[PDB]
Design an enzyme around this catalytic site. Structure first.
Site, PDB file in Angstrom:
ATOM      1  N   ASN A  32       0.842  -1.189   0.000  1.00  0.00           N
ATOM      2  CA  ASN A  32       0.000   0.000   0.000  1.00  0.00           C
ATOM      3  C   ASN A  32       0.887   1.252   0.000  1.00  0.00           C
ATOM      4  O   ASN A  32       1.883   1.311  -0.718  1.00  0.00           O
ATOM      5  CB  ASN A  32      -0.973  -0.004   1.183  1.00  0.00           C
ATOM      6  CG  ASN A  32      -1.687  -1.329   1.370  1.00  0.00           C
ATOM      7  OD1 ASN A  32      -1.546  -1.968   2.409  1.00  0.00           O
ATOM      8  ND2 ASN A  32      -2.462  -1.728   0.387  1.00  0.00           N
ATOM      9  N   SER A  33       0.555   2.267   0.783  1.00  0.00           N
ATOM     10  CA  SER A  33       1.276   3.524   0.667  1.00  0.00           C
ATOM     11  C   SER A  33       2.684   3.523   1.228  1.00  0.00           C
ATOM     12  O   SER A  33       3.397   4.495   1.042  1.00  0.00           O
ATOM     13  CB  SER A  33       0.454   4.682   1.235  1.00  0.00           C
ATOM     14  OG  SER A  33      -0.555   4.996   0.271  1.00  0.00           O
ATOM     15  N   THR A  34       3.119   2.449   1.886  1.00  0.00           N
ATOM     16  CA  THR A  34       4.537   2.395   2.240  1.00  0.00           C
ATOM     17  C   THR A  34       5.383   2.432   0.949  1.00  0.00           C
ATOM     18  O   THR A  34       6.519   2.862   0.978  1.00  0.00           O
ATOM     19  CB  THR A  34       4.933   1.166   3.090  1.00  0.00           C
ATOM     20  OG1 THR A  34       4.708  -0.037   2.344  1.00  0.00           O
ATOM     21  CG2 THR A  34       4.137   1.036   4.352  1.00  0.00           C
ATOM     22  N   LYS A  80       5.136   4.436  -1.427  1.00  0.00           N
ATOM     23  CA  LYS A  80       5.442   5.829  -1.725  1.00  0.00           C
ATOM     24  C   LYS A  80       6.897   6.189  -1.386  1.00  0.00           C
ATOM     25  O   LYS A  80       7.440   7.106  -1.970  1.00  0.00           O
ATOM     26  CB  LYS A  80       4.490   6.783  -1.002  1.00  0.00           C
ATOM     27  CG  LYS A  80       3.035   6.745  -1.571  1.00  0.00           C
ATOM     28  CD  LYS A  80       2.071   7.606  -0.754  1.00  0.00           C
ATOM     29  CE  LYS A  80       0.758   7.862  -1.502  1.00  0.00           C
ATOM     30  NZ  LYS A  80      -0.039   6.635  -1.684  1.00  0.00           N
TER      31      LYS A  80
END
Length: 244
Positions: free
Chosen positions: A51-53, A55
Site C-alpha cells: 500500500n502507501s509504504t 510511496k
C-alpha cells in the site's frame, strides 16, 4: 512467502501484550549491533501489498529519475476535489509524503518506464517484484512484500546507485518526530477491502545519538490500519528502550 535465509543471530521477541487483539509482526534492525529483532517470525515472512509504504520507493525513483529534485518537487493541483483539503492544493515531496497524497505519487509513477521499475525492484530485492498490470500495482494488487523484507530492503537501499542527496531529501520527507533523544521517520500504509481494514503497515527508522534502527510493523488482522501499526510501532520502540 519470503524464504531467503536470514544469516543473523537475531533476537526473538514476544510483543503479544502490545499487539493485543491485533495479529501481525514486528521487525527491527540495529545498525550498530548488526542485529535483527523479530516478533512472529513466520508471519514476518508472509508477503502482503505494501500500500502507501511504497510511496517511499516511488519518491526515491522520482528523485533518481529527476522527475523531482531538491530545488523543486512541487506539483500543481489540477483542481480535482478530494475529501481532505490537504489534498486540494499544490504539493511538494514533504507535504505529499506527510499527507500520503495519492495523486502526487500517481503522477510520479505515470512517468516511470516499466523497465526501470523492474530493474530497481530486482536490484532492491523488493518482495515478489510483481508489477502485474503496472497501474496502481502497489495498492492491494500484484506487488507484495513481507514485513521482514520491508526492513531489509529499506535498510539496504538507504545504507549503491541512489545518490546521497536523493537519500537525504527522501529522509527529510519521512521525518515524523524529533526530540532530544531521537528522530523518528516512517510511512503508513493501509489496505481497505469493501470497507474493512485488511492490511496495516508502518515502516521507518529511528536515529538516536548512538544508533540507527530500521523497523516495520505489519498488521494482518484485528484492526489492521496504518494508524494502528504506527501506534503499535511507537509503543514497542518505547517499551524496548530505543526512544531514550
Amino acid at each position: 512467502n519470503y524464504k531467503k535465509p536470514l544469516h543473523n543471530d537475531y533476537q526473538i521477541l514476544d510483543k503479544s501484550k502490545i499487539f493485543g487483539s491485533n495479529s501481525g509482526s514486528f521487525v527491527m534492525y540495529s545498525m550498530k549491533k548488526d542485529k535483527y529483532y523479530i516478533y512472529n517470525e513466520k508471519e514476518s515472512r508472509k508477503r502482503y501489498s505494501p500500500n502507501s509504504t511504497y510511496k517511499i520507493y516511488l519518491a526515491m525513483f522520482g528523485l533518481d529519475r529527476h522527475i523531482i529534485n531538491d530545488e523543486n518537487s512541487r506539483m500543481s493541483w489540477n483542481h480535482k476535489h478530494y475529501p481532505f483539503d490537504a489534498w486540494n492544493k499544490e504539493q511538494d515531496l514533504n507535504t505529499a509524503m506527510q499527507n500520503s497524497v495519492n495523486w502526487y505519487f500517481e503522477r510520479i509513477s505515470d512517468q516511470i518506464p516499466k523497465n526501470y521499475t523492474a530493474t530497481q525492484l530486482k536490484q532492491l530485492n523488493y518482495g515478489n517484484k510483481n508489477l502485474g498490470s503496472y497501474k496502481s500495482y502497489w495498492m492491494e494488487d500484484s506487488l507484495k512484500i513481507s514485513n521482514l523484507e520491508q526492513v531489509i530492503v529499506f535498510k539496504n537501499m538507504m545504507e549503491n546507485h541512489f545518490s546521497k542527496k536523493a537519500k537525504n531529501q527522501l529522509s527529510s520527507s519521512l521525518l515524523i518526530k524529533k526530540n532530544e533523544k531521537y528522530e523518528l521517520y516512517g510511512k503508513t500504509g493501509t489496505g481497505i477491502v469493501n470497507g474493512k481494514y485488511n492490511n496495516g503497515w508502518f515502516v521507518g527508522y529511528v536515529i538516536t545519538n548512538h544508533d540507527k534502527y530500521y523497523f516495520a510493523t505489519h498488521l494482518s488482522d484485528g484492526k489492521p490500519s496504518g494508524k494502528n501499526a504506527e501506534l503499535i510501532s511507537e509503543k514497542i520502540l518505547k517499551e524496548m528502550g530505543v526512544l531514550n
